[PDB]
Design a protein around this nucleic acid. Structure first.
Ligand SMILES: [Mg+2]
Ligand SMILES: [Mg+2]
Ligand SMILES: [Mg+2]
Ligand SMILES: [Mg+2]
Ligand SMILES: [Mg+2]
Ligand SMILES: [Mg+2]
Ligand SMILES: [Mg+2]
Ligand SMILES: [Mg+2]
Ligand SMILES: [Mg+2]
Ligand SMILES: [Mg+2]
Ligand SMILES: [Mg+2]
Ligand SMILES: [Mg+2]
Ligand SMILES: [Mg+2]
Ligand SMILES: [Mg+2]
Ligand SMILES: [Mg+2]
Ligand SMILES: [Mg+2]
Ligand SMILES: [Mg+2]
Ligand SMILES: [Mg+2]
Ligand SMILES: [Mg+2]
Ligand SMILES: [Mg+2]
Ligand SMILES: [Mg+2]
Ligand SMILES: [Mg+2]
Ligand SMILES: [Mg+2]
Ligand SMILES: [Mg+2]
Ligand SMILES: [Mg+2]
Ligand SMILES: [Mg+2]
Ligand SMILES: [Mg+2]
Ligand SMILES: [Mg+2]
Ligand SMILES: [Mg+2]
Ligand SMILES: [Mg+2]
Ligand SMILES: [Mg+2]
Ligand SMILES: [Mg+2]
Ligand SMILES: [Mg+2]
Lengths: 129, 61, 384
RNA sequence: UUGUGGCAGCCAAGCGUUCAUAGCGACGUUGCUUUUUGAUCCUUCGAUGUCGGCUCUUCCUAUCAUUGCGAAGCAGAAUUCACCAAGUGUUGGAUUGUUCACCCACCAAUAGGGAACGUGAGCUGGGUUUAGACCGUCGUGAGACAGGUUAGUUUUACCCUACUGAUGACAGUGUCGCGAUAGUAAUUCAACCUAGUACGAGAGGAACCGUUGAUUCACACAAUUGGUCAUCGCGCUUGGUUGAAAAGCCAGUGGCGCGAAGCUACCGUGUGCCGGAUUAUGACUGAACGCCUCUAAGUCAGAAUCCAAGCUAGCAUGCGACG
RNA sequence: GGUGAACAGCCUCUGGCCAAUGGAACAAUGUAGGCAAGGGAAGUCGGCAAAACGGAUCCGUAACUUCGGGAAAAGGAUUG
């Protein structure tokens, strides 16, 4: 599948919301696939599906747990040609358990490791880099 | 070979090296090393640093 | 009184005692099982870790995301000038184990290998083997040496060659006292093995005659020494809260009341590093032989004429002038350390093992500071 | 000791749409266990630091998941009962001092226990458990409270041993070796292919091989990236100071920027292993018993198992070959 | 004396000292003092400890109020 990347975003990290859904701000509460280890916080990286709450935004989206996908991280990570690439901010988009985006558009760049792993986000993406 | 250029200092970047920044406007900045990267984020202007490629063409050095 | 929450144990009990190694040269603790239909080959060398750098290559691995893509990988360079075979040792199977039956040395031994037998060469008389040498100049003496060969052919179950390094050809190593070891001959009969070893006394073995391209090899040696280390770094246990009286960097409980003893399984402070280690399946990316194009760092895609040595030389090593060997990944030991390359004991069958390597670029920019030129003339012509 | 707590048997009236025993099991009855409590008062009152958590290791099996199987009211998928099995794993959080509990979430799974109810010269001190103080009930009162509340000192190792490392004598001195014994380590998941296939009316819906990855752990290493500065390396700068300029110095590292080298991070990179004997179980041959029968004699296949190999040590007051 | 609102802190002159056993080296564990990518209380009984803020000039300042306050509220801009 994908290669392993520097995990940037532990639980309690609060991320920007890059879609036209009305959520402003996602709050990671867990990461899908994390079989834990004593005292180690579950962490996410670009293309990782997470569970999150909405702490700023529309009333109908708040106070509910929902799946999201990380699209941007500030933590540098090593591409497999050698470069260490990173973004200006942390971002993710609201999806279903099957990966379908709740919104319709994405604002800003998208990590290539995410677009190749979620084809519905890939479709809505502006510039995949 | 397929070299690449530093967006800040204007030097050649050889394969397997460099730091690639993505800015909110989707513009890609590729730096040669961490000296360039820290001056960039400190908001220095590579035209005012004497050792840069932009500076040298601007003063015909 | 069960522990509330469980987590795997810190550290491995399989590398105890974590003491200083009793050896500076790495010891081959097992040779590849012999296959009498193979021709007589050798199974190990002594190299010197020169330094590291990185390649960029292109992958062929159908089904992988890296297929038809580039990749960057660290590599280590081991300088491996030819070995010189000075002796032969025979082994015989006994109920207690393997036993040395006899041994024959070459007539001429260099000053370097003879330094190996002294702890102060300079103020000695340098008499080592000065009388065994005379066995080569009298027919009664020649008779013995020839008769010893017959005895090995007659009874040996295993034959090994004694070889020393040409330590003098690495001026960066401020060493004149060569390293000496036994290397087992595999393949052929015992009569074949004895002929192969003796026939080739006083001569040089390149690394080509033993190791090939893209084969997997084990590397043996002693790791870097770090002195006396506490439990947090030596064993990897977690730190205690900030507000602990008498210190954070320890293990809170070293055992229960019963047994009324501290167990060997608990983490303690002590020596860290300078341990013997055998490290498997380090792949060979490139063999560099002095006098051919394969020595320099010019690929089929990059033709810039440059040597393997980075600008300013390998740090804390010097300049690689002789034969060398390019391994994927990292190597036990610091720079300048003698390493033991050993043929794999296993069968290599997996797709990684069979994979063919084609380099596209070798970084020879300086490993001091942030290197930015590949050659000195590139630098000189850039500036003025 | 075992009433009580927990686990397990036997018989079989009934349930299980019909069928005592697939899965259960009433009325009865036999045990085991010693993480409960009760009962007792044997040890300790010239003192064995008294809850919990944190940290770390080890051990048990009454097995939750992981491996191999047997049964079913097992079509498939899922689920249930049982066996061999303790090799590996059993998490992140909200509230509570809590053990316990209970929700949120992930997960293959979030099993159950012991070690002076492991672990205070290991911590912590939230609770409880002195002296201050408030409330409520009780008391004529001093005061009481197995009621609630708030503030309240956590001492010592340099000894012996254990453990971890470090020298070292005992056939002159040195080099190369052998290898008794002791330790030991790898782990689990996912995506694609098989496959919308088997199975099935449909609804649903697998797996082996093959491929590519990832988790937990372990051992190294520093080419790149990141971290680190008193390179006091270069630059700038506040205050002072040497009449000034230049050059510096002081403000315990004056401060800031960049900073090689070394060290170092799942925050970086690499690597992590082949034979044999078998368990459960299914069988072969084949009597006892003209048939039958995995068993009696003789054979077979067989596992996250055990023993090897491999890896670490090897003063084993062991040994070999040479100079 | 200088800086400055300042008997603050910091440097200097008069005057006074360098009296605190020395030498070598720079392991663990300490103690005192720093810095740390991404995240930001998930740690913990509990933000304990640390970090962040901080001078001055201009602007602007809510609830509530015993009308005296709150108030340096909050929130902005500037500074050689
Ligand atoms: Mg924890
Ligand atoms: Mg416990
Ligand atoms: Mg447990
Ligand atoms: Mg490590
Ligand atoms: Mg304390
Ligand atoms: Mg370097
Ligand atoms: Mg009982
Ligand atoms: Mg009972
Ligand atoms: Mg009594
Ligand atoms: Mg009593
Ligand atoms: Mg008492
Ligand atoms: Mg006492
Ligand atoms: Mg007593
Ligand atoms: Mg005691
Ligand atoms: Mg059992
Ligand atoms: Mg104690
Ligand atoms: Mg208290
Ligand atoms: Mg009181
Ligand atoms: Mg009371
Ligand atoms: Mg002590
Ligand atoms: Mg053993
Ligand atoms: Mg750096
Ligand atoms: Mg560095
Ligand atoms: Mg049959
Ligand atoms: Mg003034
Ligand atoms: Mg003053
Ligand atoms: Mg930080
Ligand atoms: Mg908190
Ligand atoms: Mg909390
Ligand atoms: Mg917690
Ligand atoms: Mg709490
Ligand atoms: Mg505080
Ligand atoms: Mg207020």
């Amino acid at each position: 599948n994908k290669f392993r990347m520097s995990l940037g975003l532990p639980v309690a990290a609060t991320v920007n919301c890059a879609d036209n859904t009305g959520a402003k701000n996602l709050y990671i509460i867990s990461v899908k696939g994390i079989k834990g280890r004593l005292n180690r916080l579950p962490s996410a990286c670009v293309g990782d599906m997470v569970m999150a709450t909405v702490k700023k935004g529309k009333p109908d989206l708040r106070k509910k747990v929902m799946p999201a996908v990380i699209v941007r991280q500030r933590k540098p990570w090593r591409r497999k040609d050698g470069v260490f690439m990173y973004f200006e901010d942390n971002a993710g988009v609201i999806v279903n358990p099957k990966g379908e985006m709740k919104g319709s558009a994405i604002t800003g760049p998208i990590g290539k490791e995410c677009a190749d792993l979620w084809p519905r986000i890939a479709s809505a993406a502006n510039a995949i880099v | 070979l397929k070299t690449e250029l530093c967006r800040f200092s204007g030097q050649k970047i050889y394969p397997g090296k460099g730091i690639r920044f993505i800015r909110s406007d989707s513009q890609v900045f590729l730096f040669a090393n961490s000296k360039c990267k820290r001056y960039f984020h400190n908001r220095l202007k590579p035209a005012k640093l004497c050792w840069t490629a932009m500076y040298r063409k601007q003063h015909k050095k | 009184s069960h522990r509330k929450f469980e987590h795997p144990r810190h550290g491995s009990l399989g590398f105890l005692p974590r003491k200083r190694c009793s050896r500076h040269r790495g010891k081959v603790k097992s040779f590849p099982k012999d296959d009498q239909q193979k021709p007589c080959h050798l199974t190990a060398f002594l190299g010197y870790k020169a330094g590291m750098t990185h390649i960029v290559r292109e992958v062929e691995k159908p089904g992988s995301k890296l297929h038809k893509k580039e990749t960057c990988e660290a590599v280590t360079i081991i300088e491996t000038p030819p070995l010189v075979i000075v002796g032969l040792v025979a082994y015989v199977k006994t109920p207690r184990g393997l036993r040395t039956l006899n041994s024959v040395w070459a007539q001429h031994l260099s000053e370097d290998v003879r330094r190996r037998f002294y702890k102060n060469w300079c103020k000695s008389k340098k008499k080592a083997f000065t009388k065994y040498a005379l066995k080569y100049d009298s027919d009664s003496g020649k008779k013995e040496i020839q008769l010893q060969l017959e005895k090995m052919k007659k009874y040996a179950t295993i034959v090994r060659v004694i070889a020393h390094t040409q330590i003098r050809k690495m001026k960066g190593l401020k060493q004149k006292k060569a390293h000496l070891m036994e290397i087992q001959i595999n393949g052929g009969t015992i009569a074949d093995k004895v002929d192969y070893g003796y026939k080739f006394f006083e001569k040089e073995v390149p690394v080509e005659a033993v190791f090939q391209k893209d084969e997997m090899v084990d590397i043996i040696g002693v790791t870097k020494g770090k002195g006396y280390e506490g439990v947090v770094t030596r064993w990897g246990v977690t730190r205690l809260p900030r507000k602990t009286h008498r210190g954070l960097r320890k293990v809170a409980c070293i055992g229960a009341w019963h047994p009324a003893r501290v167990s060997y399984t608990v983490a303690r402070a002590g020596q860290n590093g300078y341990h013997h280690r055998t490290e498997m399946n380090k792949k060979i990316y490139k063999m560099g032989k002095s006098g051919q194009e394969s020595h320099e760092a010019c690929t089929e895609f990059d033709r810039t004429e440059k040597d393997i040595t980075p600008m300013g030389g390998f740090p804390h090593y010097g300049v690689v002038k002789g034969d060398y060997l390019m391994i994927k990944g990292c190597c036990v030991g610091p720079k300048k350390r003698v390493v033991t390359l050993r043929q794999s004991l296993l069968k290599q069958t997996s797709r990684l093992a069979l994979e063919e390597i084609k380099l596209k670029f070798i970084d020879t920019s300086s490993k001091f500071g942030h290197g930015r030129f590949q050659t000195t003339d590139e630098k000189q012509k850039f500036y003025g």
